[PDB]
Design a protein around this ligand. Structure first.
Ligand SMILES: CN(C)[C@@H]1CCN(c2cc(-c3ccccc3)nc3ccnn23)C1
Lengths: 218, 232, 339, 257, 55
């Protein structure tokens, strides 16, 4: 080798060192994908937890969270959903105050989206945290307009607890092969600050499972 | 882009002194640095080299053990420390930047220099001419000869041409034989083969008068050749 | 009323164009190339392996000197390689890590990238300072960018997933021409050798030919049965090739305005990610998501060789301008050079 | 010299197999695959295991040649010391491995984020160094090295070695119990039966195929006989060879499908 | 709705008046191009190891 070849080799080695350091830093972060409907309520979740797609960063008990929101992309999602194949968790926001409203009923649209995401080929073993928002308006509206509007075959008492349990069961039953992934459900409202703790507790299980796999015993 | 160096002055024999150079306007950490000195009336001479990342250091045989080179990236400074000063170290010192990757142009910016006065197996590069009388509008050729082939097995030839005007620091013209540097008019051309090289100027204005130098970069310690003067 | 009348009129012209192109199909390509010797067997071997990306590769592009190449990955980095020595020249970090395409300028002074941020970013490689810095951020699209190709140092062409291609002026920052004729997302581009017309393929299973100057659509081609993911011109400039999700590749002609050949096999049931040609035009290289690449005899519809050695999906491939090597990228974060 | 015809053949047969597996592991981890913070332990285990098995094969061949072809040579005593070293190092890595797993469940955030990058190398170097030191002070003071022996010091160092082995066993059991209890108390999203089976398999193999040789060699001979040597040595070597060969299957091959 | 139909009809009208040539001539042109550039194709015919940069 000539002198300039040796200098070029040194340049390449320094580039490699920097790349390795950046990869080590990036491999220790928690990445989340945020999904929901337009009026489901995600802006309140973003406020409480802190064109193109939007990124949010925060920190909670020595952990770094990056949250990705893709609500503005109005196109075929079968073409870019494999970019998020390796991701720690999916947050799904549903408003349980729009069973009466019509855009096709909104609740059925939410069910179709949940069914499509849950049973995908890229998310076989990915955890889902499900938020059910706006319970105050639901408790106020459950007394006037009956729930039979959305579910004709309900046949049950008309109060807050029974309706909430029925809707949660209807959402959880859409998970074919419910032996390779977990689903976490929480009831939130506009004025409530405990959701970050819920996300942290959900993510700790994923971390335990991943670093058992790094050690061999899966 | 600028490089300003300081230190300098008059010292008695046997002393020690430090010379500094500060850079502004470019990415200093991704560059390698050279110290080059010139005697009061003689030609150029290479002194020391430090690399990017501070991993490789090279010295000439006249200063090995007496000189030291160092750099400070966060404050963008380059240092040269001198001990046991003889009377042969009286000169003017320049700082030179260079970068090395595929297609780069080394030796493409020089500082202004500082003056130091002290009271009282190498390739040989030959330029057999001196002081060619020229008139504007004509065409001129200069020749150079090496004692060892500068053509490496990878198809490269390492020959450099430099221009120094009166009162000014040298400026790069052709870096690797037949390659033209940025901001240089297309009057200049360079050619050669093996051990014999030539430089050609097509039709010359009154600003390209001075001394022309040749340098090899095949292996250290980076020899020069005594220049040729163009007089009007 | 007039709407149904116009619908009937529109239906009456597809029949005319179909009958017109059925009357210029006297023979077939297989019937004409039945008396030439077949290329025996291509045994290629890996000569270099480029390491350094820490996530899946999405795009690559060769330079016009056939020695330098650029690569893009989901790790957020853009890397420039010297293939003769296997050492890195530049590493560029990106503001957005969701990159889906990259390109290299014919002059060699600029590179480009884009993705899910709906912006095309242009990078300058030759500055007085030694670093690489951004020159322009072109922002006018409403969907993700799927491909981009330079025309010169001041013109670029982009295709987006909002059913539109565009032609830009880099200095001003505006788009001089917008091409709108498709129905789904546009996934691939290709420039003609004379840089006077280009082809595009989309998710409506159609391919279209354009004029850069006037700005209108000349011809439409419809043979496939699913999304079209790759497209490439013949070296002549009078034919092109397409790859799709229905496990076939097809060859289309411009002057005859119809299809010439299909490439398929019964043991292949997955889709095609990329296509490219050889310098003479006799071999056709295709990349599949069953982890390997296939070589086809373009004149006889025969399989002449397999390129195996990747552990995951093959995302991109390219052939040099001198025709000396082929490069493949993959979802396993490796690049390979075959000769 | 007449009832030990079969055990030596078994030792040769089950030691020839292990070399292939450990060589494959060394080659695959060297260039073929990538490395994380856990692979270092597997490399160290494979190297120690390879040395031990090679020395066993050499002794078996020397005995067979000096039996069937009686005019033969003698195996130098110094080699014996080296064998011992490997054995001890081979018993250290396993315990280390167990400890790591326990930590990765009792402190997950620290393991994922705050863990240093060169801990594995430091621990492996220290464990090899201590094993070498102990083996050399056993050999020097007890006649295996080219010097003069002694009686009391050989027993003292042998007893220290036995204490070291017992400490290793206790560490392994404690870590395994802590991990099992933590999983039992509360866990959501784990295949439990497979984990319990793997943990019990590791402990049982360590107990019934690693220790008997060492316990015999360093303690039973000094405490006690004419049958204690000949009727107990070959079974012990058989068991240690079995564990030595079976380690790579457990720690590198069952996991990879 | 009427504007879209009108645009589609005009585009089809513009695309239905083009000169077309036979498939035989196109195939012959393709075959001739491949036959006239066979020697200068390194992938089809391997080059000796003394003229191969990747070796
Ligand atoms: C593991 N150690 C190294 C083996 C096993 C026990 N052993 C041993 C040694 C000696 C001895 C002491 C001093 C000088 C020469 C020989 N005497 C006896 C009597 C019963 N065992 N034994 C050697």
């Amino acid at each position: 080798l000539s002198a300039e070849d040796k200098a070029a080799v040194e340049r390449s080695k320094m580039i490699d060192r920097n790349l390795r350091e950046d990869g080590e830093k990036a491999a220790r972060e928690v990445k989340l994908l945020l999904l929901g409907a337009g009026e489901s309520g995600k802006n309140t979740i973003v406020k409480q937890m802190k064109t193109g797609i939007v990124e949010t960063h925060f920190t909670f008990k020595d952990l770094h969270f990056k949250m990705f929101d893709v609500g503005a992309q109005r196109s075929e999602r079968k073409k870019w959903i494999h970019c998020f194949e390796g991701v720690t968790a999916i947050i799904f926001c549903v408003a349980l105050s729009d069973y009466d409203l019509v855009l096709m009923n909104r609740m059925h649209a939410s069910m179709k989206l949940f069914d499509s995401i849950c049973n995908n080929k890229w998310f076989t073993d990915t955890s889902i945290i499900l938020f059910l928002n706006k319970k105050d308006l639901f408790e106020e509206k459950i007394k006037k307009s009956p729930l039979t509007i959305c579910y004709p075959e309900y046949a049950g008492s008309n109060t807050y607890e029974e309706a909430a349990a029925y809707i949660q069961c209807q959402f959880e039953d859409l998970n074919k092969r419910k032996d390779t992934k977990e689903i976490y459900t929480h009831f939130t409202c506009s004025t409530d600050t405990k959701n970050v703790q819920f996300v942290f507790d959900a993510v700790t299980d994923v971390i335990i499972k991943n670093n058992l796999k790094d050690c061999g015993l899966f | 882009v600028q490089l300003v160096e300081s230190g300098g002055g008059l010292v008695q024999p046997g002393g020690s002194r430090k010379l500094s150079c500060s850079a502004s306007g470019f990415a200093f950490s991704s560059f390698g640095m050279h110290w080059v000195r010139q005697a009061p009336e003689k030609g150029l001479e290479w002194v020391a080299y430090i690399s990017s990342g501070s991993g490789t250091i090279y010295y000439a045989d006249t200063v090995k053990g007496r000189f030291t080179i160092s750099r400070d990236d966060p404050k963008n400074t380059l240092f040269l420390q001198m001990t046991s000063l003889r009377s042969e170290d009286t000169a003017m010192y320049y700082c030179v930047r260079s970068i090395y990757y595929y297609g780069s142009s080394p030796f493409d910016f020089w500082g202004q220099g500082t003056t130091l006065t002290v009271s009282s197996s190498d390739i040989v590069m030959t330029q057999a001419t001196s002081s060619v009388p020229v008139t504007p509008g004509e065409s001129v050729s200069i020749s150079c000869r090496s004692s060892k082939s500068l053509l490496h097995s990878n198809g490269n030839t390492y020959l450099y041409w430099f221009l120094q005007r009166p009162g000014q620091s040298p400026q790069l013209l052709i870096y690797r034989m037949s390659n033209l540097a940025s901001g240089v008019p297309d009057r200049f051309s360079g050619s050669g083969s093996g051990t014999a090289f030539t430089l050609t100027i097509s039709r010359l204005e009154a600003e390209d008068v001075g001394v022309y130098y040749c340098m090899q970069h095949l292996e250290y310690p980076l020899t020069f050749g005594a220049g040729t003067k163009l007089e009007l | 009323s007039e709407l149904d009348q116009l619908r009937q009129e529109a239906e009456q012209l597809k029949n005319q164009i179909r009958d017109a192109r059925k009357a210029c199909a006297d023979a077939t390509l297989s019937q004409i190339t039945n008396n030439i010797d077949p290329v025996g067997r291509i045994q290629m071997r890996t000569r270099r392996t480029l390491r350094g990306h820490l996530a899946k590769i999405y795009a690559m592009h060769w330079g016009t000197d056939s020695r330098l190449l650029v690569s893009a990955s989901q790790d957020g980095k853009l890397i420039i390689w010297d293939s003769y020595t296997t050492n890195k020249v530049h590493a560029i970090p990106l503001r957005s890590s969701w990159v889906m395409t990259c390109a290299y300028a014919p002059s060699g002074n600029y590179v480009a990238c884009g993705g899910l941020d709906n912006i095309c970013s242009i990078y300058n490689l030759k500055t007085r300072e030694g670093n690489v810095r951004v020159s322009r951020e072109l922002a006018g699209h409403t969907g993700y960018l799927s491909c981009c190709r330079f025309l010169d140092d001041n013109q670029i062409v982009t295709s987006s997933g909002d059913t539109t291609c565009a032609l830009w002026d880099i200095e001003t920052g505006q788009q001089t021409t917008t091409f709108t004729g498709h129905t789904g997302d546009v996934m691939s581009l290709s420039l003609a050798p004379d840089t006077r017309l280009f082809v595009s393929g989309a998710c409506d299973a159609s391919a279209k030919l354009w004029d850069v100057r006037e700005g209108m659509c000349r011809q439409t081609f419809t043979g496939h049965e699913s999304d079209i993911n790759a497209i490439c011109f013949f070296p002549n400039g009078n034919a092109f090739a397409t790859g799709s999700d229905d496990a076939t590749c097809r060859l289309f002609d411009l002057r005859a305005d119809q299809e010439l050949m299909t490439y398929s096999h019964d043991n292949i049931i997955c889709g095609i990610t990329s296509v490219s040609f050889s310098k003479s035009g006799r071999l056709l290289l295709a990349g599949y998501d069953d982890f390997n690449c296939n070589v086809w005899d373009a004149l006889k519809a025969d399989r002449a060789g397999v390129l195996a050695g990747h552990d995951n999906r093959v995302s991109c491939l390219g052939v040099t301008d001198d025709g000396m090597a082929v490069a493949t990228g993959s979802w396993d974060s490796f690049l390979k050079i075959w000769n | 010299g007449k009832e030990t015809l079969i055990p030596v053949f078994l030792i040769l047969f089950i030691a020839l197999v292990g070399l292939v597996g450990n060589g494959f592991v060394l080659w695959l981890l060297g260039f073929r695959m990538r490395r994380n913070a856990f692979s270092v332990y597997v490399l160290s285990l494979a190297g120690a295991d390879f040395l031990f098995l090679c020395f066993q094969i050499i002794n078996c061949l020397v005995y067979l040649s000096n039996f069937f072809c009686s005019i033969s040579i003698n195996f130098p005593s110094f080699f014996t010391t080296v064998m011992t070293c490997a054995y001890l190092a081979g018993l250290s890595m396993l315990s280390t491995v167990s400890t790591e797993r326990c930590l990765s469940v009792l402190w997950p955030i620290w393991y994922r984020c705050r863990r240093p990058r060169h801990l594995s190398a430091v621990v492996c170097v220290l464990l090899w160094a201590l094993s070498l030191l102990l083996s050399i002070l056993e050999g020097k003071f007890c006649g295996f090295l080219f010097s003069d022996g002694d009686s009391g010091w050989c027993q003292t160092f042998d007893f220290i070695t036995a204490a070291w082995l017992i400490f290793l066993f206790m560490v392994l059991c404690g870590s395994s119990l802590a991990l099992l209890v933590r999983i039992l108390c509360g866990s959501r999203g784990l295949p439990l039966t497979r984990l319990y089976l793997t943990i019990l398999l590791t402990v049982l193999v360590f107990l019934l195929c690693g220790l008997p040789f060492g316990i015999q060699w360093f303690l039973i001979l000094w405490i006690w006989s004419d049958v204690l040597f000949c009727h107990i040595h070959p079974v012990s070597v058989v068991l240690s060879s079995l564990n030595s060969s079976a380690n790579p299957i457990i720690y590198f091959f069952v996991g990879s499908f | 709705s009427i504007a879209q139909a009108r645009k589609l009809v005009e585009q089809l009208k513009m695309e239905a008046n083009i000169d077309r040539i036979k498939v035989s001539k196109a195939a012959a042109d393709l075959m001739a191009y491949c036959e006239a550039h066979a020697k200068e194709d390194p992938l089809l015919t391997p080059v000796p190891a003394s003229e191969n940069p990747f070796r």
